[PDB]
Amino acid sequence: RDFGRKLRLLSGYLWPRGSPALQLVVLICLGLMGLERALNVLVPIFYRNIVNLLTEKAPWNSLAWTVTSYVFLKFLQGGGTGSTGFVSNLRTFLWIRVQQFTSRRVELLIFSHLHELSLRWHLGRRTGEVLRIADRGTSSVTGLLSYLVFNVIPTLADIIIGIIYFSMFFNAWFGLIVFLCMSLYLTLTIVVTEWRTKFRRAMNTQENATRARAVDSLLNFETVKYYNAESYEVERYREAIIKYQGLEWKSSASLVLLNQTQNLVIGLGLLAGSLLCAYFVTEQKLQVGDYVLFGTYIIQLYMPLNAFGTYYRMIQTNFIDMENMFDLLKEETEVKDLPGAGPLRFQKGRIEFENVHFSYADGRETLQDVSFTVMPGQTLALVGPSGAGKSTILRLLFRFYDISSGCIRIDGQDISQVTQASLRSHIGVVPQDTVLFNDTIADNIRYGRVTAGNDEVEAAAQAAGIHDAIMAFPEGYRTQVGERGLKLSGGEKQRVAIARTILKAPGIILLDEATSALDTSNERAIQASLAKVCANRTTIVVAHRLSTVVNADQILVIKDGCIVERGRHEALLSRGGVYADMWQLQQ
Amino acid sequence: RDFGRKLRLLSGYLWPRGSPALQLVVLICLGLMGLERALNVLVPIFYRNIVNLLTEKAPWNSLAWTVTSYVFLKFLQGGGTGSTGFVSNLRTFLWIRVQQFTSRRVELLIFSHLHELSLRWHLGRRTGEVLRIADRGTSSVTGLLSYLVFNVIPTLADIIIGIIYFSMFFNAWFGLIVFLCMSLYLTLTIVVTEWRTKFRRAMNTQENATRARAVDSLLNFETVKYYNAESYEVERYREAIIKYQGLEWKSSASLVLLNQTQNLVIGLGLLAGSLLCAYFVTEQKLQVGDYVLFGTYIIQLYMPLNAFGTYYRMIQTNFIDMENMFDLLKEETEVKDLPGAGPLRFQKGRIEFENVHFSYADGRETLQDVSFTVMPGQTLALVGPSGAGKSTILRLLFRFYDISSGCIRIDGQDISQVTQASLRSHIGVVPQDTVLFNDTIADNIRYGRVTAGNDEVEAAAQAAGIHDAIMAFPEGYRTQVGERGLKLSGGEKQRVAIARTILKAPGIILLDEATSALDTSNERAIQASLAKVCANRTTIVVAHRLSTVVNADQILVIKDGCIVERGRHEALLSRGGVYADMWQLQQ
Ligand SMILES: Nc1ncnc2c1ncn2[C@@H]1O[C@H](COP(=O)(O)OP(=O)(O)O)[C@@H](O)[C@H]1O
Ligand SMILES: Nc1ncnc2c1ncn2[C@@H]1O[C@H](COP(=O)(O)OP(=O)(O)O)[C@@H](O)[C@H]1O
Ligand code: VO4
Ligand code: VO4
Ligand SMILES: [Mg+2]
Ligand SMILES: [Mg+2]
């Protein structure tokens, strides 16, 4: 069953592996834990000893030596109540190393997973939820591991010794009944604990949303301030707390009732034997004062079984709380690299389609019967009314989603066979919407080729028509862009983005509605420079202002998921089709 | 004594305020704690008497009655160490209600103080810091309110009893000596810890930036997948762990040294006491065994002081964490209402500028001597090369920032006097870059006037032009736009907002940049339908695509922080000014 798989994987990250130095530190700590109880029991023996020594009034040397030994061992024991003693503390301080290892490995695991799911799962997420799961997750493991070694192993070993012992002290068969009693006690408390899982699960899956209403709301500050707000949002946030309030108060209370009902049954189970002894005593059939054995008997079962019960609840809570993470760690990727493939041989660069169809949700065909080819060194442009499907034709060629029928070829090879890691090398895009890392421009613009020196980056942004404005800034390049990169400007953000790709100097360039959001003037230059410095030719560019693709080699028009009519500029203008109407309306 | 001020705010929310029902639950819990201690001490006396009276002979139902009473007394006892008794659990379960109250009244506080800071602080934040610093704060308060009810108060009360008691048992002046000795002990243990506190702030600050790498990276998938990564992002993420990891190492060890070394003082003190006792016993005056009396006296000084000390370090840690939290509350709004402000009177919406000067950080002038007036019912259009500062002029009229000289008047009235709460109600704005809440279209487009019903919103979006394309979607008005609304489309993401403002129906409108994404055709229709709404309402529109403002009422050109030339389209073109150059190059 499932429990199997979970545990197995869990086998590794629980027990330190591969680093023998941290392999050993668990054992020393375990052994010191073992030594602690023995020392605690041993100390009173020497206390009694010194007592008698005192009694006889022995010479000062022997009594002083015994005093020194006693104080030595009392210091090493630590003194009971708070275990605030040497041998006890050394455990914690030598534990603070192995815990850090297993806390690092879990967290730096799932993070390396969130950057490999396909783009669809990214768009569909809700940032609050995914941000929270990691927080509750890692705490679960770092709690389980620091809880399994201190308590469960010692108690279990002690009780198994207790059952192995006393077998010869009583009859030979006495061990079997004790083992069966322990097993039967265990199996009874299992069925009763299913009263908990439903409420904990409800808590948890309702807590995630009440995080989403926070981080989602705070994320877009400008929208909540433009329209009048700040009294709708606080109110709505409160009304999501009360639900979580009520749903907790059931789960927390349901623990205490289960705790008391566990205790009471054991208490009256022992009271039955006590009343049996009372019946035997008082001259009913005997006056035996055998309470010496019975009084010892109640503790030796009251401690271990209640202790064993009150921990199994803790472990059950920890797994049911963990349960949510496993999912974000098993949702497999989508687009997949066909096992066994290599780099995509690269030549001057020729891309072609043939008979591609693609649908987002099977409700309707987003793209039907697309077919177009481009020769190296030429420029191909798309123009269409909003939503017709300009963005998707470009977004497929970079292989986020996956084709349905037909095929896409780069320079004579399919893209399905070639590994996807290489395909990202030669293709550079500038996105429809730009985002920036919250860091200074100098670090942000070099991000394409980390090796690049501090002169070439200056050379690149100069060709992008942005350099002359930046130097006039106060503080120079050390200026900070600010969160999500809107503090900088309204348009210069686009120019920074367009410099990013120029730095990388890829093979093929896929500008997308890039020239917009600028001004009619600077555009001419960006284009001109981009041209001279066009890197490797083969460029596809989707733009709306027709005054920027007038001289492109080939032009396409997309009405709805299908090519309408194609040609060059002057030749297609006289045709008098829809493109003619767009141009005429664009005065 | 800033500590003086800080405390109040603590006293405000710790002890329940204003709610007598949750006022009472503190006293019941405290009293139950006390009676728990009383039961724990009382039971053995009961047990000893029952054993003695049962021991001899001859019970007549008295043994049974006493045994049953004993069993229930044990049931209420809880058996000491485990606290698994009907008294101990009642404490926790009646503690759940009051704690949750404090946990709420803190978290909902700062969330309503985090939507009132002005815009500049927001553009300067790091989402990691602000999202984390709340989580630590809302844990510190509920943690601190645990100790000052369960642990510290009982121990302090016990010390007060122990010092008032034994005053008749010994000389009266003894209590003064004991009090002075305890104060002297406390005086040293403060100085030893304060060395530690300058060594936790480094940990806590260093954690913030590490959180900054996570959320800020995960906040933009596109820019980390378009180029190649996961061989740089993970690698850099590890580094911001190792630094943190080592810093925690160097901290949490300092607790162990400064917890053991305190013990060694007490151990040496007890060694000195025992050695003096032995020297006195060894026939110095007599073989009197005074050690039995002395040891109990010594343990009296031992435990009510070691316990007092070891509950002084947790308090210090808790105030370090709250110390990092308070700073977010002390910050003040950059702009604040002038006290005693009357709501604005709105007649026709004429707006007037008078010699405004404004800069962001005193490095350079951003706007110089702007002067323009528009009468009601007209259209003003700004056109100029990027970075000149049209966006700032638009952002200023809404009172986000504040002016430096001169004033701006709305309907012949200053805006320095009127409270900002009224001003934002009349004005409608569609932003430069759109954002969306992660919820269905029906929720985002409705957000303008929550009262408005399902009919008016449907009628409204028709004027926008989005209506036809929506129903072609599967699921209609209940589709999901996903996080930050980049799943919808490229163009429609603006048409939604341009419907939102129409729904609010303000007095005056400030379209920042409508026709950037929308294509050419859908434009003409949106412009025509927008005019049909009402010719009376005044609008400010700033558009790079120069076609859309051909026939506006009057036009301004901004070169750099200053007006250049003003006039209507037909007359100004013949002037042959810079506007002529822009238009001619555009054609
Ligand atoms: N992730 C998605 N989820 C739902 N619908 C989508 C998604 N991506 C694209 N679409 C649909 O496909 C169309 C894509 O058109 P697109 O080429 O983006 O238009 P534009 O060129 O204006 O950006 C949109 O109209 C949208 O309805
Ligand atoms: N929040 C800010 N902090 C500092 N400087 C800013 C801020 N916002 C804008 N600026 C500077 O002031 C100018 C504002 O120009 P803006 O009106 O945004 O130009 P555009 O309209 O072309 O986007 C920009 O050049 C930018 O350098
Ligand atoms: O706000 V702009 O950079 O499009 O003038
Ligand atoms: O909405 V667009 O057709 O400019 O990608
Ligand atoms: Mg702007
Ligand atoms: Mg698009």
Author numbering:
A (entry chain A), B (entry chain B): 240 to 826
Question: Which passages does the manuscript contain on this structure?
Answer:
Human ATP-binding cassette transporter subfamily B6 (ABCB6) is a mitochondrial porphyrin transporter that uses energy from ATP hydrolysis to translocate the heme precursors protoporphyrin IX and coproporphyrinogen III from the cytoplasm into mitochondria for heme biosynthesis. ABCB6 is a Type IV half-transporter of 842 amino acids with only one transmembrane domain (TMD) and one cytosolic nucleotide-binding domain (NBD) with an extra N-terminal TMD (TMD0). It functions as a homodimer with the substrate transport pathway and the active site of ATP hydrolysis built from residues from both chains. Within the transport pathway, a conserved aromatic residue W546 located in each monomer plays a pivotal role in stabilizing the occluded conformation via π-stacking interactions.
To evaluate the structural impact of W546A mutation, we prepared grids using detergent-purified or nanodisc-reconstituted W546A mutant. As expected, the first 3D classification analysis revealed that most of the detergent-purified mutant molecules (59.5%) adopted an outward-facing conformation. The final EM density map of the detergent-purified W546A mutant in the outward-facing state was obtained from the best 3D class containing 56,293 particles at a resolution of 3.9 Å with C1 or C2 symmetry, which enabled us to build an almost complete model of the transporter. The structure has the typical features expected for the outward-facing conformation of an ABC transporter. The TMDs form a V-shaped translocation pathway that is both open to the extracellular space and laterally to the membrane outer leaflet. There was no density corresponding to CPIII, suggesting that the bound substrate is exported from the transporter prior to ATP hydrolysis and ADP/Pi release. However, the structure has relatively poor electron density and high B-factors for the extracellular side of TMDs, suggesting that these regions undergo highly dynamic motions to promote substrate release. In the NBD dimer, the two Mg2+/ADP·VO4 molecules are sandwiched at the interface, interacting with the Walker A and B motifs, the A- and Q-loop residues of one NBD, and the ABC signature motif (LSGGE) of the opposing NBD. However, adoption of the outward-facing conformation exposes negatively-charged residues E346, D374, E446, and E487 at the bottom of the cavity. This negatively-charged surface appears to promote substrate release into the extracellular space by pushing porphyrins along the translocation pathway via charge repulsion, while simultaneously preventing exported substrates from re-entering the cavity. Conversely, adoption of an outward-facing conformation shifts the side chains of key residues away from the substrate-binding site (lower right).
